[PDB]
């Protein structure tokens, strides 16, 4: 019944996934040894969505871990919740990542893909009504960026009906950490457009901004950074796992938010966030959450929606609250700021409520939006790639793995067409 299969790719995907599983394990109340010790019977109602049952009261998540280097698996095993994962599901290589898209896609991708597909196929048969697959990877280096596209393409070939959704991290415009990110991201965009139904883009620079303003972290680390992304994932799937006044699964979200097949890149947001010295003052209520969600500063993508126009957007609420209040807030925000929204799609803001709020929070909400502000992110990488590829001899590193230079021009051509389609639908 509506099970979900989780896939983690590369260094960034594995560390985010490790924090992600720690969140759901805490939410359901699973001891690190793998035995249930929680306090509410509602937690065991639908644990089949993310967890499998082993003999003896031990639960094992439907987790597939993929990397080309073993060092990442060493950290995963040594982690607090490392023992929870199935040892056979740890699939890894024995060579360096390469920091290259073509190297990951062609040379080692073919060797690893057969083993990874079989391992996933094991978990695919252990679920009655597997709704869709979930992928965690970054577009920067090439391990997740390169291999993730190949795996995503194969999954679509095997399971066309299922909803393929990915959570991708884009190269930051200023804190980019590789001389050759624009090449890797541009090549990855072509496969992402045609394969994945739903794509969520998150940028590190926005994450650093959010932590500094609101959370006031003096020395933030990746653990604090990935906690917010783990919150966003947990809220999205909350409808399947728990009761609510208005259930809304992923296939509901895809129908509402996507007007046309190619326009499916989304921007996500989370609320509430408060400095741990300021939580005394906040009269946290439904209107307070609405202000945080639609505030431009809380967005985890470094693209201002105000400069663009809004397409269909949805908001999911967790906790106990009045249905009328949620409905009125969405109506007020839609009518107050009519300049932001397109006129020809009324009722832009979809609502949904789930009954149980997360730990510690009396109520919480998550925001997912679709807008043409993504053109700014694509403009940054397009301009950088143009100045990269002008010195055409830098392509030689990708040529060694079999990548012909004509692939770069075609990838930009498809990428340029995506901008033009976004430009056209602005009016």
């Amino acid at each position: 019944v509506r099970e979900i299969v989780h896939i983690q790719a590369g260094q960034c995907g594995n560390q985010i996934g490790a924090k992600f599983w720690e969140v759901i394990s805490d939410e359901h109340g699973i001891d690190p040894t793998g035995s249930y010790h929680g306090d509410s019977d509602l937690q065991l109602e639908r644990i089949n969505v993310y967890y499998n049952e082993a003999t003896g009261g031990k639960y094992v998540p439907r987790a597939i871990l993929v990397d080309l280097e073993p060092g990442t698996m060493d950290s995963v095993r040594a982690g607090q919740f490392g023992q929870l994962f199935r040892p056979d599901n740890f699939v890894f290589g024995q060579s360096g990542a390469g920091n290259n898209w073509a190297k990951g896609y062609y040379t080692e991708g073919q060797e690893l893909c057969e083993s990874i597909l079989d391992v996933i196929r094991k978990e695919a048969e252990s679920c009655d009504c597997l709704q869709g697959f979930q992928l965690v990877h970054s577009l920067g280096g090439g391990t997740g960026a390169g291999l993730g596209t190949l795996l995503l393409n194969k999954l679509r070939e095997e399971y066309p009906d299922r909803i393929l959704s990915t959570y991708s991290i884009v190269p930051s415009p200023k804190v980019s950490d590789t001389v050759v990110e624009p090449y890797n991201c541009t090549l990855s965009v072509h496969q992402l457009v045609e394969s994945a139904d739903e794509v969520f883009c998150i940028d590190n620079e926005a994450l650093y901004d959010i932590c500094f303003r609101t959370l006031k972290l003096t020395t933030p680390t990746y653990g604090d950074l990935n906690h917010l992304v783990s919150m966003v994932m947990s809220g999205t799937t909350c409808a399947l796992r728990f009761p609510g006044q208005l259930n809304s699964d992923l296939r509901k979200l895809a129908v509402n938010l996507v007007p046309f097949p190619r326009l499916h890149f989304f921007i996500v947001g989370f609320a509430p966030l408060t400095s741990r010295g300021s939580q005394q003052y906040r009269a946290l209520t439904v209107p307070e959450l609405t202000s945080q969600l639609f505030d431009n500063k809380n967005m985890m993508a470094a693209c201002d929606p105000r400069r663009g126009v809004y397409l269909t957007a949805s908001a999911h609420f967790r906790g106990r609250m009045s249905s009328k209040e949620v409905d009125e807030q969405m109506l007020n925000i839609q009518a107050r700021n009519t300049s932001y929204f397109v006129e020809w799609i009324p009722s832009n803001v979809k609502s949904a409520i789930c009954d149980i709020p997360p730990r510690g929070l009396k109520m919480a909400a998550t925001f997912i939006g679709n807008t043409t502000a993504f053109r700014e992110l694509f403009t940054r990488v397009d301009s950088q790639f143009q100045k990269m590829y002008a010195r055409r001899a830098f392509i030689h590193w990708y040529v060694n793995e079999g990548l012909e230079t004509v692939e770069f021009d075609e990838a930009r051509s498809n990428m340029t067409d995506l901008i033009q389609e976004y430009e056209m639908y602005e009016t």
Partner: protein
């Protein structure tokens, strides 16, 4: 004896039904499990011994809402086969509900309903609840009604559906599902009532002193109207009204069936001390636009026929005087060709309260059902919203990929235009 059957489709139908049966158990006096601590045959079936079973069927593709009843306190009352659950939502897609997933489960529900009808030897009528915006409510409901219309023939299939609110919308594809479902109802539904959430929210905020209502309060108010409609067939009275009587008098034609609903007195506890609430006071409150369950002002349109149902200590003398007083109002418009317009019915069963509820314990109450041309205002809003979407083909790709042909969209658009033309033609005068 003389039986009725209820069908609940979609999320809204199940939650509305949960509130409805809560009132029925208290009014009829049954434990949550079904044991005793009459009209019992009319609503419930007797399984021998001391246990009763309701004549209700719950259908939804979402297992979640059904499982809440399965794990709820009332689980022992509900017979396990009566609870039908699917695997996944219809994704708010009418094509998905009507063609892909609905056909996988339609035969299971039809067989159970036919099985249930065998025990209802004196059955007359069906009640189906819908949510127009939801995919299952519209996609599955249209398929179910098409099957039931040919299966049972001449039976009164009454419906009670939730029309989309004028401004409060939770589904973006809601206009698409509303129009396509409307095409189905106008052909296969004998008589279908409408309500909207936005008017209920305003009424629950103004009349009742409830600051922040939820779906729980809205469901209970709807259940009160349904109980009042069925109270004539469940208790003695000076003027009993059958389902055939409603069908003949409410509708003047076939395609103009759509009635409107209202209820009074909607009053909180502390106000009930402060007032007297005679028959004249409750009669006047019905026609005020504030109390209307659909956000449309009757003053823009006219009244075609009206039906009033009375419960409690009502005396036929006072009803006649109150009706005569209403006719003297120039603010209420009636067509020249329907001077009578009114049918009154009286029943002796007072309204039943619910502990921890939102309503008072009034000695008497009145239900209002009528047909008016002001409902054409709501049709204009939905028609305009659909044209804006279809001008740019904003969501065609989702529906076509689920097996529904694109040519069905203009057909539904044309059918709605004829309905609007019919209402204008009938509202005309010579």
């Amino acid at each position: 004896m003389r039986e009725v059957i209820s069908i609940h489709v979609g999320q809204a139908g199940v939650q509305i039904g949960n509130g409805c049966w809560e009132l029925y158990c208290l009014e009829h006096g049954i434990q949550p499990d079904g044991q005793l601590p009459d009209a019992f045959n009319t609503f419930f079936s007797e399984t021998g011994a001391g246990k009763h079973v309701p004549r209700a069927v719950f259908v939804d593709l979402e297992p979640t809402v059904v499982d809440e009843v399965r794990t709820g306190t009332y689980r022992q009352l509900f017979h396990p086969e009566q609870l039908i659950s699917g695997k996944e939502d219809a994704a708010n897609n009418y094509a998905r509900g009507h063609y892909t997933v609905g056909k996988e489960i339609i035969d299971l529900t039809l067989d159970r309903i036919r099985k249930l009808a065998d025990q209802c030897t004196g059955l007359q009528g069906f009640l189906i609840f819908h949510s127009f915006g939801g995919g299952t409510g519209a996609g599955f409901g249209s398929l179910l009604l098409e099957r039931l219309s040919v299966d049972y023939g001449k039976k009164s299939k009454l419906e009670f559906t939730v029309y989309p609110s004028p401004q409060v919308s939770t589904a973006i594809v809601e206009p698409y599902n509303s129009i396509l479902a409307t095409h189905s109802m106008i052909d296969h539904s004998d008589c279908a009532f409408m309500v909207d959430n936005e008017a209920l929210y305003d009424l629950c905020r103004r009349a009742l002193d409830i600051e922040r209502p939820t779906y729980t309060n809205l469901n209970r108010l709807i259940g009160q109207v349904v109980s009042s409609l069925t109270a004539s067939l469940r208790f003695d009275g000076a003027l009993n009204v059958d389902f055939t009587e409603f069908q003949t008098n409410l509708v003047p034609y076939a395609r103009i069936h759509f009635p409107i609903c209202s209820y009074a007195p909607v009053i909180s506890a502390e106000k009930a001390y402060h007032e007297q609430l005679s028959v004249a006071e409750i009669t006047n409150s019905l026609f005020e636009p504030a109390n209307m369950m659909v956000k449309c002002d009757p003053r823009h349109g006219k009244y075609m026929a009206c039906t009033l149902l009375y419960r409690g200590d009502v005396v036929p003398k006072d009803v006649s005087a109150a009706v005569a007083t209403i006719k003297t109002k120039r603010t209420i418009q009636f067509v020249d060709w329907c001077p009578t317009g009114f049918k009154m019915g009286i029943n002796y069963q007072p309204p039943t309260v619910v502990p921890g509820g939102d309503l008072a314990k009034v000695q008497r109450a009145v239900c209002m059902l009528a047909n008016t041309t002001a409902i054409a205002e709501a049709w204009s809003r939905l028609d305009h919203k659909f044209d804006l979407m279809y001008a740019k083909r904003a969501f065609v790709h989702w529906y076509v990929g689920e097996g529904m042909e694109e040519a069905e969209f203009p057909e539904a658009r044309e059918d709605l235009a004829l309905l609007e033309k019919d209402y204008d033609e009938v509202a005309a005068e010579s």
